[PDB]
Design a protein around this ligand. Sequence first.
Ligand SMILES: [Zn+2]
Ligand SMILES: [Zn+2]
Ligand SMILES: [Zn+2]
Length: 82
Amino acid sequence: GSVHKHTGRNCGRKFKIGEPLYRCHECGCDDTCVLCIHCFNPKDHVNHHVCTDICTEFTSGICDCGDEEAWNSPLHCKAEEQ
Ligand SMILES: [Zn+2]
Ligand SMILES: [Zn+2]
Ligand SMILES: [Zn+2]
């Protein structure tokens, strides 16, 4: 794959139509806190209740990876992996 790292800042990627918005019950500050496909690291959420929404005209947003106020636990952004 090829994916942009956002080291030292938040992701903030606007979701594209058809894309999943990842939600983690355990990690998210609340249920508006979401991760994009570049960022969501399944290893962070092995023991967690995770769900996806799909981006449409009415369900939109931006990825919260790297916004420390959105997350209870440290995230390991998938983009950072080698
Ligand atoms: Zn992201
Ligand atoms: Zn990220
Ligand atoms: Zn989690």
